[PDB]
Structure 1
């Protein structure tokens, strides 16, 4: 009655094989209020399944203390998908990558005794078996696995370990074995998948991720061919362009897979959404996870991509009865043109006509009728006769993004952040420099490195008007340099190379000089071999040239630390906290001023358009609406990179259809309709870089052809 098994062909849901069209919708990147409309948009788009990760570090802020409220009501989210007649692929992880802060591991886990991440390690295995079992027991509890009549038809253990395992060697393989056996062991009564495991143990199905994976094949023949991440674009990194992937090529990629015994494919992403707060953003990942997905960050339809995939699904579902009762058989149709024919003993016939030439439309002869195949396309013939769909012919009207203000420029108040300096009574100190994750435990992006640089009165630069050289080398990711109160320097990294060096002459004078270094993180690293062990914050070396001695090693003094900002320790983002300091009303409003808090109240704009914040006036920091973390703003970083005009045809890569070069890397910042009330809306912004808060205006998203 209720069963999920599999064969060499496809997934068997209820004794019936199925070709499963699926979409990734990460729950914590939406509001619970948006969930059902997004899920409905998915249903209308031709999706059978909704895929998501579980967010380990969202769910356990500290050991044993869990959070499944609001955006993290996972059981609610799965139930809502079930409510929509769609299935669920639950990729538990707990490592999930997903451009998510620290890959999803809680930071506290890093510091458990004897701990190592993703390897045959006792502390790690225990904590991981722990979380995976808690989630599965929560899922089992309300019969949410399909064997019990629920939506979950599949689960994922780890995420993309194959590459990491190929480098760690024997521990890695001894952990891949372990992870598979001690997840299957939870007896969920539905299959377990692993993506990028050329070596996944029976009975775990290895899947792939990529732009194209028509070449792929499971690690044993009685496993079906499964595509867990059809990338629908790419992530937007801070100071990067907005990566698009064209819909004629996504169609083309999916059809290339399904024509070749493809049975499960999942768009990553279907809905991208927002990295809300300082707990979401992976390293350098911008607040927008829009991902050029078929639903944009704001849940509106990305046309014609949405419409064009909707039609492809329809064309697949007309083909499905053939697809499930035969196998993909091939027949050359010319130099670079092919035919994949699903012909059932009963009489069903589905035919995929392919044309792999990236330049020239080609006409082929199939079963006596002519067919014109536009270049880099496939024509779907669900009857083997009428081409009802072609992955180049786009029959959905486009829709372009328009942001149009409403609410009017608000009246602002300011508050300035203390620029702290060393004090002979600081408690948190050491000789030499400490790593940032170690000190902050990721309670805040901000860490103050402070020390005393004494300068003897007989110095060369105290004779000739001249400044000593300051050189600071920090693991990342932003660094502000403060001398005796005033700001001497500001340097920042990219995703690829987050390490930085500040070099510059610095006005010191005889006696004790104050050095205060503000190192900031932009989320934690989320991917790579041993990514967890990477450093952040100032580890040096730190020198001061132009002295008599010659060049002073400042890394070998007493340094003192202070975690995070005062405004944070006050929580000036919440209504209670924001009424506790003297705000600077009137016209003295700090303009183009570093380390400044801002504050305005406004009324919900008109009706039912999605909203955002224009902040191209500002530099960098965080936004909060009504005490909830909107996310990080960083319009000060200008999109670096190639932005050639783009053709659908030919092999794709992230870099192909890059957009928005020269502009702020994210101008607009998403604000849920569900986070506003009619009036009394407390906007609070921390500006870390300097900007003019008068230019902050609310906007409405809408689209037209």
Structure 2
């Protein structure tokens, strides 16, 4: 009764070939209350398919122990897409990349004996197989594959493994063949895909990802041409600018794919949303995952992009009957101009008129009619006669963002975190430096590295006014050097160069001195060959120079360790644990002091406009609302980059249209309205660096013209 197949031309759904317009919405990057609205906006946006990864590390935070509640109710999500009458592309992975913590892998999986990620490895294959089968059976049980009458029209195994293969060699090739075969073996009833996988074995369709995919061809003539990730922008990193991609360029890129036998394209992202909590964003990925998506982080329409693409879709639909019953024939129109014509025997005809010149308009003559093609544009003629649309002629009104403060400054109470000093009587120690992930298992961003340094009272520097020199090399990502109780410096890295060295004169005194290093990870790496093996934390070298002896290798002494903060162990973020301790009030409020907790109670504003926290007054830390993790803040990290003004025309790259340079990387932090009660809301902020909580203001988001 229902089926999904495919031929050289398209995916065939229930016996009908389709030109499928898709967009990505990641279920855990918004709330269940937001989903129907997001999905409805997608539908009105002209999307046929919603595409999502599955996030293993969210769904299995402990072997055998699963989570499918709240924003992680995968089944609830898929069912809401079905209710909107849209299809689903379930990209199961379970390596997913996605700028997501560890690429989606549960951290515990690293520490399974014999384990090795994304290669021909028995522990890996068992774990991977097990979870993929769990997800497929969960879907099948509720008849959620299209074959069974459900919305899922295809699924992805792995993610962009192709590049990784080339470096890993034969074991990669064997893993690829295994992953494809095992996926197909789960008998979903619908096609399987792998992205960036030139060697995908039948019957798996290999797809394309990027800014443009118009030249791409699947690895067999009898597979449709599909573009699984049309990048709508780029991620925002802490330390980085807000990257935009011009709607006119996207529409061009899409038109250019479709005109050339493309039959499936998917905006990555259609709704980017938010990296909530502390196990969502990957290495240095900002809380905001806006991606300059057609639906902004807050779920509002990103005009004009949203509309311009709605118009594109409308035009593709007018062309569809012709598109699906012919093949693209190319007629040269000029030096740098083409016609792509889909003429069926039924008489139905659709034409695409292109101008690849990035500088000049060209007048072109097609079937006796003149067409002005703006630079870097395509005109779509659904009947081969009248241009209903052109990729550079944007007929939606633009929109910009306003954040209107609402409520005011709340009453704050503080709670100072202690700066721990090692001693003779510690619990968890070793004669060397341990890698952070290994020690913390990612239970917290924080690991204290602690040691004693003995200074003999005859030391040269003691006789004079001098201070010895301390070098702390760390694999990243932030490091606070504490000497004899006091903060001595803070060094921090970038996505590209997460490595750190602190280098400074430290005032030591005769006898036993206390060094305490606060090592902080900001998400776990999520992309790269052997990215799981990359280190975090202070693995040194660590030297103390300017002594009677030459330098002293402090990696070679006894170290002690404290995982996490005490506020974490006390859950000062939840309502129960917060009022199980006692906080400072009034005048004696923690002002610009590191490692501080702050707490306040507020009423939800009225209105139906999305809400954020203005955290400009703050440094770096985490935010909770009624015990639910809003995410990490890091307004302290100023955006660095090249932010020239750009035009839509010409080959786009992620750095072309960057904005907000010399401003806080992310100032506003999304708060889902579904997280609020009318009154008595608990706002907890751990401040890592130092900030003034008073000026923390709640804000209301609208989009003007």
The TM-score, its normalising length taken from structure 1, stands at 1.00
Is 1:327 matched up with 2:327?
yes
Distance 2:589 2:609 in 1: 31
Q: Give the secondary structure class of the aligned counterpart of 2:317.
A: helix
After the TM superposition, list the runs of 4 or more consecutive aligned residues in structure 1 that deviate by more than 2 angstroms. Answer: none
1:1-21 CA distances to partner (integer Å, 9 max, x unpaired)?
Answer: 200000000000001000000
Could you list the per-position Cα deviations for residues 50-105 of structure 1 after superposition, in whole angstroms to 9, with x for gaps in the alignment? 00000000000000000000000000000000000000000000000000000000
Counterpart-to-counterpart distance in 1, 2:605 and 2:360: 50
In structure 1, runs of 5+ residues without a counterpart are: none
Query: Alpha-carbon deviation of 1:550?
Result: 1.6
- Number of aligned residue pairs: give it: 705
How many angstroms does 1:110 deviate by?
0.1
Q: Is the 8 A contact 1:103 1:282 kept in 2?
A: yes
In structure 1, how many angstroms separate the alpha carbons of the residues matched to 2:252 and 2:606?
40
Cα deviations by residue, 1:589-638 (Å, 9 ceiling, x for unpaired): 01110000000000001211100000110000000000000000000000
Cα distance per residue 1:647-695 (max 9 Å; x no partner): 0000000000000000000000000010001001000000000010011
Displacement of 1:253: 0.1
| Distance apart, 1:423 and its partner CA | 1.7
Q: Distance in 2 between matches of 1:425 and 1:110?
A: 31
Contact 1:328 1:340 in 2 (8 A): yes
Q: Give the secondary structure class of the aligned counterpart of 1:539.
A: coil
Q: Deviations over 1:543-590 (max 9, x none)?
A: 000100021100000000000100000000000010122201001101
Secondary structure in structure 1 of the residue aligned to 2:685 = strand
Secondary structure in structure 2 of the residue aligned to 1:184: helix
**Deviation sequence 1:375-407 (CA, Å, 0-9, x none):** 000000000000000000000011100001011
Q: Which residue of 2 aligns with 1:302?
A: 302
Q: Check the 8 A contact 1:283/1:495 in 2, yes or no.
A: yes
Q: Distance in 2 between matches of 1:580 and 1:597?
A: 14
Q: Hey, what's the Cα distance between the residues in 2 that align with 1:427 and 1:677?
A: 42
Native 8 Å contact 1:341 1:352 kept in 2: yes
Aligned partners of 2:311 and 2:30: how far apart in 1?
26
Matched residue SS, 1:197: coil
The aligned counterpart of 1:278 is 278
CA-to-aligned-CA distance 1:230-253 (integer Å, 9 cap, x gap)? 000000000100000000000000
Aligned partners of 1:491 and 1:500 also within 8 Å: yes
Quote the Cα distance in structure 2 between the aligned partners of 1:92 and 1:400.
35
What displacement does 1:425 show? 1.3
The aligned residue for residue 437 of structure 2 is 437
Question: Which whole-Å deviations, capped at 9, do the CAs of 1:346-377 have from their partners, x for residues lacking one?
Answer: 10000000000000111000000000000000
Q: Is the 8 A contact 1:21 1:313 kept in 2?
A: yes
Per the alignment, in what secondary structure is the counterpart of residue 352 of structure 2? strand
Say yes or no: does 1:575 pair with 2:590.
Answer: no
Deviation string 1:499-518 (CA, Å, 9 cap, x unpaired) is: 01000000000000000000
- Give the Cα separation in 2 of the matches to 1:10 and 1:54: 25
Structure 1 Cα separation of the partners of residues 632 and 639 of structure 2: 16
For normalisation by structure 2, the TM-score amounts to 1.00
**How far did 1:433 drift?**
0.1
SS class of match (2:677): coil
Any idea what the Cα deviations from partners look like across 1:391-443, whole Å, max 9, x if unmatched? 00000011100001011111100000010000211111000100000000000
1:479–1:491 contact (8 Å) kept in structure 2 = yes
Query: Partners in 1 of 2:114 and 2:10 — Cα distance?
Result: 42
C-alpha deviations, 1:137-192, integer Å up to 9, x for none? 00000000000000000000000000000100010000000000000000000000
State the SS of the aligned residue for 2:294. Answer: coil
Deviation at 1:704, TM superposition (A): 1.2
Give the aligned partner of residue 170 of structure 1. Answer: 170
Separation of aligned partners in 1, 2:219 and 2:494: 37
Cα distance in 2 for partners of 1:657, 1:174 equals: 40
1:291 matched residue in structure 2? 291
SS at match of 1:644: coil
Distance 2:433 2:666 in 1: 33
| Alpha-carbon distance in structure 2 between the residues aligned to 1:475 and 1:563 | 17
CA shift digits 1:452-471 (9 cap, x unpaired): 10100001111101100000
Q: Which runs of 5+ in 2 are unaligned?
A: none
1:477 touches 1:493 (CA, 8 Å); kept in 2?
yes
1:522 and 1:389 mapped to 2: Cα distance?
44
Moved more, 421-430 or 173-182: 421-430
Mapped to 1, the partners of 2:227 and 2:475 lie a distance apart of: 37
Q: Give the superposition deviation at 1:219.
A: 0.2
CA distance in 1, matches of 2:290, 2:168: 34
The separation in 2 between residues aligned to 1:281 and 1:167, in whole angstroms, is: 26
**For residue 406 of structure 2, what is the aligned residue in structure 1?**
406
Deviations 1:242-301 (A, max 9, x none): 000000000000000000000000000000000001010100000000000000000000
Aligned mates of 2:650, 2:14 — CA distance in 1: 40
Corresponding residue for residue 391 of structure 2: 391
Preserved contact between residue 406 and residue 606 of structure 1 (Cα < 8 Å): no
C-alpha distance in 2, partners of 1:687/1:357? 51
Taking the aligned partners of 2:182 and 2:477, their CA distance within structure 1 comes to 38
Question: Tell me, what secondary structure is at the counterpart of 2:38?
Answer: helix
Name the CA distance, whole Å, in 2 between partners of 1:423 and 1:79.
56
Distance 2:141 2:505 in 1: 64
CA–CA distance in structure 2, aligned partners of residues 680 and 555 of structure 1: 49
- SS in structure 2 of the partner of residue 652 of structure 1: coil
- Is 1:701 aligned to 2:701, yes or no? yes
Cα pair 1:603 1:678 within 8 Å, conserved? yes
Inter-partner Cα distance in structure 1 for 2:427 and 2:681: 39
Aligned residue in 2 for 1:54 = 54
Partner residue of 2:370?
370
What does residue 538 of structure 2 align with?
538
Q: Deviations over 1:179-227 (max 9, x none)?
A: 0000000000000000000000000000010000000000000000000
